[PDB]
């Protein structure tokens, strides 16, 4: 019903910032991409939809320091992000972190996302990597692991695939209803 907070957690470090500014529709072609300040609170309206969605990023443990409280969730929508390249972040986020998130509560809406798309690029990093090195892990591979359960969304985001995290802000208002 009211603005809701959301945080992004992934393997080690993911979509540090470029992800936070996704909706910003900055798109690589644009030099704009300040990372000096971490964003996680922005008020934007869509076609007459006044709401505010907070978004986190990298920060592995998202609390490297254990001293901090491990209880009292400050988010209602869990956003998992992994770089679309290197089965490392993919195999972990959806597998190793899933149980960590599940422990917090029985079941809750889960949005699936990725970072640095296919290696901060996709067109100049796929051909340069080598056809036999492309080893993509999103198209269907990602859908399988989501199906293993039942996330919510299914896409990526990286100064490009931010064709979702953009259309997400609007979906965020839907989460507030819950």
UniProtKB/Swiss-Prot annotation:
Broad class of where this protein is predominantly found: membrane
Gene3D superfamilies, per the entry: P-loop containing nucleotide triphosphate hydrolases (3.40.50.300)
Residue positions binding GTP: 10-17, 57-61, 115-118
Residues bearing attached sugar chains per UniProt: 32, 35
InterPro entries: Cdc42, P-loop_NTPase, Small_GTP-bd, Small_GTPase, Small_GTPase_Rho
Entry keyword annotation includes Phosphoprotein: yes
Disease: Takenouchi-Kosaki syndrome: An autosomal dominant syndrome characterized by macrothrombocytopenia, lymphedema, intellectual disability, developmental delay, and distinctive facial features.
Function: Plasma membrane-associated small GTPase which cycles between an active GTP-bound and an inactive GDP-bound state. In active state binds to a variety of effector proteins to regulate cellular responses. Involved in epithelial cell polarization processes. Regulates the bipolar attachment of spindle microtubules to kinetochores before chromosome congression in metaphase. Regulates cell migration. In neurons, plays a role in the extension and maintenance of the formation of filopodia, thin and actin-rich surface projections.
Protein name (Swiss-Prot/TrEMBL): Cell division control protein 42 homolog
Assembly, per entry: Interacts with CDC42EP1, CDC42EP2, CDC42EP3, CDC42EP4, CDC42EP5, CDC42SE1, CDC42SE2, PARD6A, PARD6B and PARD6G (in a GTP-dependent manner). Interacts with activated CSPG4 and with BAIAP2. Interacts with activated CSPG4 and with BAIAP2. Interacts with DOCK11/Zizimin2; the interaction activates CDC42 by exchanging GDP for GTP. Interacts with DOCK9; the interaction activates CDC42 by exchanging GDP for GTP. Interacts with DOCK8 (via DHR-2 domain); the interaction activates CDC42 by exchanging GDP for GTP. Interacts with IQGAP1. Interacts with NET1 and ARHGAP33/TCGAP.
Extent of motif Effector region: 32-40
Gene: CDC42
(Microbial infection) O-AMP-threonine: residues carrying this PTM: 35
Keywords in alphabetical order: Cell membrane, Cell projection, Cytoplasm, Cytoskeleton, Differentiation, Disease variant, Glycoprotein, GTP-binding, Hydrolase, Intellectual disability, Lipoprotein, Membrane, Methylation, Neurogenesis, Nucleotide-binding, Phosphoprotein, Prenylation
Membrane topology category: Lipid-anchor
Species per Swiss-Prot/TrEMBL record: Homo sapiens (Human)
EC number(s) reported in the record: 3.6.5.2
Family of this protein: Belongs to the small GTPase superfamily. Rho family. CDC42 subfamily.
One Gene Ontology term of the molecular function aspect: apolipoprotein A-I receptor binding
Localization per record: Cell membrane; Cytoplasm, Cytoskeleton, Microtubule organizing center, Centrosome; Cytoplasm, Cytoskeleton, Spindle; Midbody
PTM entry text: (Microbial infection) AMPylation at Tyr-32 and Thr-35 are mediated by bacterial enzymes in case of infection by H.somnus and V.parahaemolyticus, respectively. AMPylation occurs in the effector region and leads to inactivation of the GTPase activity by preventing the interaction with downstream effectors, thereby inhibiting actin assembly in infected cells. It is unclear whether some human enzyme mediates AMPylation; FICD has such ability in vitro but additional experiments remain to be done to confirm results in vivo.
